[PDB]
mmCIF file of all heavy atoms in Angstrom:
data_model
loop_
_atom_site.group_PDB
_atom_site.id
_atom_site.type_symbol
_atom_site.label_atom_id
_atom_site.label_comp_id
_atom_site.label_asym_id
_atom_site.label_seq_id
_atom_site.Cartn_x
_atom_site.Cartn_y
_atom_site.Cartn_z
ATOM 1 N N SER N 170 122.067 -69.393 116.783
ATOM 2 C CA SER N 170 121.282 -68.267 117.289
ATOM 3 C C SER N 170 122.206 -67.417 118.165
ATOM 4 O O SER N 170 121.827 -66.810 119.311
ATOM 5 C CB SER N 170 120.048 -68.623 118.032
ATOM 6 O OG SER N 170 119.294 -69.299 117.088
ATOM 7 N N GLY N 171 123.461 -67.160 117.763
ATOM 8 C CA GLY N 171 124.397 -66.256 118.409
ATOM 9 C C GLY N 171 125.117 -66.844 119.459
ATOM 10 O O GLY N 171 126.012 -66.154 120.011
ATOM 11 N N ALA N 172 124.802 -68.109 119.844
ATOM 12 C CA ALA N 172 125.580 -68.823 121.052
ATOM 13 C C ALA N 172 127.013 -69.072 120.551
ATOM 14 O O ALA N 172 127.874 -69.007 121.381
ATOM 15 C CB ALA N 172 124.836 -70.107 121.395
ATOM 16 N N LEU N 173 127.175 -69.576 119.296
ATOM 17 C CA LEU N 173 128.583 -69.890 118.819
ATOM 18 C C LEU N 173 129.129 -68.737 118.207
ATOM 19 O O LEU N 173 128.678 -68.344 117.137
ATOM 20 C CB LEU N 173 128.420 -71.085 118.013
ATOM 21 C CG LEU N 173 129.459 -72.207 118.007
ATOM 22 C CD1 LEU N 173 129.222 -73.259 116.958
ATOM 23 C CD2 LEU N 173 130.847 -71.729 118.002
ATOM 24 N N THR N 174 130.180 -68.224 118.759
ATOM 25 C CA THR N 174 131.070 -67.133 118.171
ATOM 26 C C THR N 174 132.486 -67.613 118.114
ATOM 27 O O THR N 174 133.260 -66.939 117.414
ATOM 28 C CB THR N 174 130.847 -65.841 118.835
ATOM 29 O OG1 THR N 174 131.360 -65.854 120.094
ATOM 30 C CG2 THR N 174 129.285 -65.476 118.874
ATOM 31 N N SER N 175 132.895 -68.555 118.971
ATOM 32 C CA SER N 175 134.311 -69.018 118.894
ATOM 33 C C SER N 175 134.587 -69.709 117.618
ATOM 34 O O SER N 175 133.881 -70.681 117.321
ATOM 35 C CB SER N 175 134.495 -69.884 120.197
ATOM 36 O OG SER N 175 135.805 -70.326 120.247
ATOM 37 N N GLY N 176 135.571 -69.400 117.012
ATOM 38 C CA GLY N 176 136.037 -69.995 115.766
ATOM 39 C C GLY N 176 135.191 -69.839 114.549
ATOM 40 O O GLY N 176 135.361 -70.487 113.493
ATOM 41 N N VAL N 177 134.380 -68.699 114.480
ATOM 42 C CA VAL N 177 133.547 -68.290 113.391
ATOM 43 C C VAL N 177 134.287 -67.392 112.566
ATOM 44 O O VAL N 177 134.806 -66.346 113.082
ATOM 45 C CB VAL N 177 132.104 -67.880 113.835
ATOM 46 C CG1 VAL N 177 131.414 -67.361 112.589
ATOM 47 C CG2 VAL N 177 131.422 -68.978 114.482
ATOM 48 N N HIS N 178 134.352 -67.616 111.271
ATOM 49 C CA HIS N 178 134.901 -66.739 110.171
ATOM 50 C C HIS N 178 133.837 -66.552 109.069
ATOM 51 O O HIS N 178 133.572 -67.503 108.377
ATOM 52 C CB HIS N 178 136.186 -67.277 109.648
ATOM 53 C CG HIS N 178 136.993 -66.279 108.925
ATOM 54 N ND1 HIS N 178 136.567 -65.158 108.349
ATOM 55 C CD2 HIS N 178 138.452 -66.275 108.568
ATOM 56 C CE1 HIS N 178 137.564 -64.404 107.770
ATOM 57 N NE2 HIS N 178 138.598 -65.142 107.941
ATOM 58 N N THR N 179 133.339 -65.359 108.944
ATOM 59 C CA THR N 179 132.470 -64.949 107.960
ATOM 60 C C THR N 179 133.269 -64.174 106.785
ATOM 61 O O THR N 179 133.697 -63.144 107.200
ATOM 62 C CB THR N 179 131.230 -64.266 108.412
ATOM 63 O OG1 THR N 179 130.403 -65.161 109.183
ATOM 64 C CG2 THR N 179 130.328 -63.745 107.275
ATOM 65 N N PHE N 180 133.265 -64.660 105.629
ATOM 66 C CA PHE N 180 134.185 -64.080 104.529
ATOM 67 C C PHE N 180 133.395 -63.124 103.573
ATOM 68 O O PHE N 180 132.187 -63.156 103.542
ATOM 69 C CB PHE N 180 134.572 -65.260 103.487
ATOM 70 C CG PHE N 180 135.646 -66.117 104.200
ATOM 71 C CD1 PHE N 180 135.502 -67.014 105.052
ATOM 72 C CD2 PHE N 180 137.031 -65.875 103.809
ATOM 73 C CE1 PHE N 180 136.537 -67.873 105.663
ATOM 74 C CE2 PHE N 180 138.096 -66.693 104.383
ATOM 75 C CZ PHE N 180 137.760 -67.660 105.273
ATOM 76 N N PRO N 181 134.025 -62.035 103.220
ATOM 77 C CA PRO N 181 133.426 -60.993 102.371
ATOM 78 C C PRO N 181 132.876 -61.584 101.013
ATOM 79 O O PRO N 181 133.472 -62.562 100.468
ATOM 80 C CB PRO N 181 134.516 -59.964 102.077
ATOM 81 C CG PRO N 181 135.573 -60.261 103.050
ATOM 82 C CD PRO N 181 135.512 -61.715 103.438
ATOM 83 N N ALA N 182 131.862 -61.024 100.453
ATOM 84 C CA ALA N 182 131.171 -61.623 99.372
ATOM 85 C C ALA N 182 131.949 -61.307 98.067
ATOM 86 O O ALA N 182 132.500 -60.202 97.789
ATOM 87 C CB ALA N 182 129.719 -60.974 99.273
ATOM 88 N N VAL N 183 131.853 -62.342 97.110
ATOM 89 C CA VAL N 183 132.172 -62.263 95.669
ATOM 90 C C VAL N 183 131.005 -61.591 95.030
ATOM 91 O O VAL N 183 129.850 -61.845 95.377
ATOM 92 C CB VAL N 183 132.523 -63.585 95.049
ATOM 93 C CG1 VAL N 183 131.373 -64.491 94.736
ATOM 94 C CG2 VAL N 183 133.492 -63.526 93.951
ATOM 95 N N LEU N 184 131.252 -60.763 94.052
ATOM 96 C CA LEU N 184 130.313 -60.273 93.213
ATOM 97 C C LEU N 184 130.318 -60.918 91.831
ATOM 98 O O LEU N 184 131.203 -60.701 91.120
ATOM 99 C CB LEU N 184 130.350 -58.696 92.981
ATOM 100 C CG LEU N 184 129.496 -58.068 92.018
ATOM 101 C CD1 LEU N 184 128.014 -58.469 92.308
ATOM 102 C CD2 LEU N 184 129.467 -56.541 92.191
ATOM 103 N N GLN N 185 129.348 -61.835 91.651
ATOM 104 C CA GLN N 185 129.315 -62.711 90.441
ATOM 105 C C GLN N 185 129.165 -61.886 89.233
ATOM 106 O O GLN N 185 128.867 -60.740 89.179
ATOM 107 C CB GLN N 185 128.326 -63.826 90.677
ATOM 108 C CG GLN N 185 128.477 -64.741 91.810
ATOM 109 C CD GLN N 185 128.097 -66.203 91.427
ATOM 110 O OE1 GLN N 185 128.784 -67.178 91.704
ATOM 111 N NE2 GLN N 185 126.799 -66.349 91.027
ATOM 112 N N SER N 186 129.339 -62.696 88.108
ATOM 113 C CA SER N 186 129.056 -61.972 86.702
ATOM 114 C C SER N 186 127.576 -61.786 86.545
ATOM 115 O O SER N 186 127.213 -60.895 85.758
ATOM 116 C CB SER N 186 129.569 -62.966 85.658
ATOM 117 O OG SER N 186 130.925 -63.188 85.695
#
Side-chain angles (χ1 to χ4, degrees):
Chain N
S170 303
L173 220 188
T174 68
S175 184
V177 173
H178 197 339
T179 291
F180 284 78
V183 81
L184 178 43
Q185 295 216 130
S186 301

